[PDB]
Design an enzyme around this catalytic site. Structure first.
Site, PDB file in Angstrom:
ATOM      1  N   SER A  16       3.688   0.130  10.927  1.00  0.00           N
ATOM      2  CA  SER A  16       3.674  -0.236   9.113  1.00  0.00           C
ATOM      3  C   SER A  16       2.509  -0.903   9.084  1.00  0.00           C
ATOM      4  O   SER A  16       2.156  -2.054  10.472  1.00  0.00           O
ATOM      5  CB  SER A  16       4.535  -0.912   8.808  1.00  0.00           C
ATOM      6  OG  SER A  16       3.493  -0.954   7.216  1.00  0.00           O
ATOM      7  N   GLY A  17       1.124  -1.592   8.868  1.00  0.00           N
ATOM      8  CA  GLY A  17       0.231  -2.134   8.822  1.00  0.00           C
ATOM      9  C   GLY A  17      -0.613  -2.330   9.747  1.00  0.00           C
ATOM     10  O   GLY A  17      -1.086  -1.677  10.641  1.00  0.00           O
ATOM     11  N   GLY A  70       4.898  -0.833   4.026  1.00  0.00           N
ATOM     12  CA  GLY A  70       4.886  -0.483   2.848  1.00  0.00           C
ATOM     13  C   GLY A  70       4.958  -0.558   1.487  1.00  0.00           C
ATOM     14  O   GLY A  70       6.688  -0.077   1.553  1.00  0.00           O
ATOM     15  N   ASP A  71       4.261  -0.195   0.993  1.00  0.00           N
ATOM     16  CA  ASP A  71       4.746  -0.082  -0.682  1.00  0.00           C
ATOM     17  C   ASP A  71       5.925   1.688  -0.873  1.00  0.00           C
ATOM     18  O   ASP A  71       6.992   2.008  -1.659  1.00  0.00           O
ATOM     19  CB  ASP A  71       3.845   0.543  -1.955  1.00  0.00           C
ATOM     20  CG  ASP A  71       3.541  -1.251  -2.333  1.00  0.00           C
ATOM     21  OD1 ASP A  71       4.244  -1.891  -2.816  1.00  0.00           O
ATOM     22  OD2 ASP A  71       2.420  -1.282  -2.097  1.00  0.00           O
ATOM     23  N   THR A  97      -1.251  -2.042   4.783  1.00  0.00           N
ATOM     24  CA  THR A  97      -1.523  -2.445   4.499  1.00  0.00           C
ATOM     25  C   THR A  97      -2.007  -2.762   2.997  1.00  0.00           C
ATOM     26  O   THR A  97      -2.889  -4.062   2.484  1.00  0.00           O
ATOM     27  CB  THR A  97      -3.308  -1.264   4.709  1.00  0.00           C
ATOM     28  OG1 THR A  97      -1.995  -0.348   5.719  1.00  0.00           O
ATOM     29  CG2 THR A  97      -3.986  -2.038   4.344  1.00  0.00           C
ATOM     30  N   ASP A 193      10.569  -6.493 -18.761  1.00  0.00           N
ATOM     31  CA  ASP A 193      10.393  -5.831 -20.645  1.00  0.00           C
ATOM     32  C   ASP A 193      11.460  -4.201 -20.229  1.00  0.00           C
ATOM     33  O   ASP A 193      11.854  -4.724 -21.690  1.00  0.00           O
ATOM     34  CB  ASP A 193       9.492  -6.227 -21.403  1.00  0.00           C
ATOM     35  CG  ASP A 193       8.474  -5.527 -20.665  1.00  0.00           C
ATOM     36  OD1 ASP A 193       6.949  -5.422 -20.921  1.00  0.00           O
ATOM     37  OD2 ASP A 193       8.408  -5.330 -19.756  1.00  0.00           O
ATOM     38  N   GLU A 250       1.371   8.239  -4.046  1.00  0.00           N
ATOM     39  CA  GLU A 250       1.518   9.879  -3.401  1.00  0.00           C
ATOM     40  C   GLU A 250       1.841  10.489  -4.205  1.00  0.00           C
ATOM     41  O   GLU A 250       2.292  10.076  -4.817  1.00  0.00           O
ATOM     42  CB  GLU A 250       3.034   8.823  -2.210  1.00  0.00           C
ATOM     43  CG  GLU A 250       2.933   8.251  -0.934  1.00  0.00           C
ATOM     44  CD  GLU A 250       1.788   8.735  -0.508  1.00  0.00           C
ATOM     45  OE1 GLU A 250       1.400   9.726   0.500  1.00  0.00           O
ATOM     46  OE2 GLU A 250       1.356   7.613   0.695  1.00  0.00           O
TER      47      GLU A 250
END
EC number: 2.7.1.107
Length: 284
Positions: A16-17, A70-71, A97, A193, A250
């Site tokens: 990753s990254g 990552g996400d 990244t 919220d 994605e």
């Protein structure tokens, strides 16, 4: 020794990254252990591994789940624990990244800094999104490529979007459902919220397109009449023509899609050091 011993599970993407995490793991374990966490680690191999592991971890009495990646790793971990009783708290180590969720919560991009945030133990609850039977943390978007940067590639498509009580029905170039907004803006969006940020760009001619693009370029897109901005908890989307869906950066299948905002669903370690403008609740 200020606390009773706890249990932590690291779920990490080794490629990753920059890929530094695997090399730094033994020291991350030392630091977590010194702080009182019996720590174990799981290395993902393919897409979906992190979801499956988070699913297993649900039955193993962990106080914290640490997602290092990552996400994508993050989204997968959340998919595995979402809507389950006794969810561990989430620890974020931003090893991608891009780390849009991290930046949304001011998680340091430094490993030991991100670990400092977890060890200190202050946490916030953030909304997540449900889409049909899956989950997301950042954003969903939909449109059709012809035969904001991508707006000139969109083709007007007839759509209906039921958002809470209301109905949009008409041709559209794009829809956005945002949870976080730092991949970029609406001016007043909260992570807290229970409302999605709903953007719909209506079918527009070349001039309205030029105009929308120049307003976008300085955070003013929402000021154009062909740009709709609403806040909504439940958003149901359908059309008779086929749309591509982007979910958290994605490909996320296609329509129809039913979206629900799960208000303050996920408890996540965050800095007590810094003020978050996107949070109603800064009790941490």
């Amino acid at each position: 020794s200020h606390m009773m011993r706890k249990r932590a599970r690291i779920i990490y993407n080794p490629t990753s990254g920059k890929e530094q995490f695997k090399r730094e793991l033994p020291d991350a374990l030392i630091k977590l252990e010194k702080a009182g966490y019996e720590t174990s680690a799981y290395a993902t191999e393919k897409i979906g591994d992190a979801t499956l592991e988070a699913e297993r971890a649900m039955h193993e009495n962990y106080d914290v789940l640490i997602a290092a990646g990552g996400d994508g790793t993050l989204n997968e971990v959340v998919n595995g624990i979402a809507e389950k009783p006794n969810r561990p708290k989430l620890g974020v180590i931003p090893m991608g990244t891009v780390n849009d969720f991290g930046r949304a919560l001011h998680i340091p991009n430094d490993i030991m800094g991100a670990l400092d945030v977890i060890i200190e133990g202050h946490s916030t609850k953030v909304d997540i999104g449900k889409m049909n039977n899956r989950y997301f943390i950042n954003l969903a978007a939909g449109g059709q490529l012809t035969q904001f940067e991508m707006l000139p590639q969109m083709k007007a498509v007839d759509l209906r979007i039921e958002y809470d009580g209301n109905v949009f029905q008409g041709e559209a170039l794009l829809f956005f459902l945002g949870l976080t907004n730092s991949m970029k803006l609406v001016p007043d969006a909260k992570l807290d919220d229970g409302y999605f940020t709903l953007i719909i760009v209506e079918k527009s001619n070349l001039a309205e397109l030029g105009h929308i693009m120049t307003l976008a370029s300085r955070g003013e897109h929402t000021k154009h009449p062909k740009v709709i901005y609403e806040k909504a908890k439940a958003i149901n989307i359908s059309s008779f023509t086929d749309l591509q869906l982007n979910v958290d950066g994605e490909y996320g299948g296609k329509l129809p899609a039913n979206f629900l905002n799960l208000e303050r669903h996920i408890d996540v370690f965050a800095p007590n050091d810094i003020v978050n403008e996107e949070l109603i609740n800064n009790d941490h």
